Amino acid sequence: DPDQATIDVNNRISAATAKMPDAVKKLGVTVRKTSSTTLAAISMYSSDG
Amino acid sequence: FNTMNATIGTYYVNDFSMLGKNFQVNIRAKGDFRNTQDALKNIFVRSND
DSSP: OOOHHHHHHHHHHHTTTTSOOHHHHHHHHOOOOOOOSSSOOOOOOOSSO | HHHHHHHTSSEEEEEOOOOOOOOOEEOOOOOOOOOOOHTTSSSSOOOOO
16 A cells, blocks of 8 residues: 555654654655656757747 | 853754764753852853943
8 A cells, every 4th residue: 555655654754753864854854655667758948949 | 141051951952964963052050060050250241341
């Protein structure tokens, strides 16, 4: 389950935000669920210039 | 109070990284006083002048 695993990592980041440098705390460690690959790639440009 | 916590208690200052860990900076006092009334004649704090 992506969510059961996600909110299991969360319960370890906040659990270990004590053994943490103070400078990384202020900007906040971010946890998210997203694939390690790339699904697609869009390109936009000017057809004239 | 900042002088008070740094002499009889423990003042958490900041942190530094040594040997791959992250240590806090605590400021205690070595301390070898008779009584507490005698210890109050040994803790100084400057005025605004």
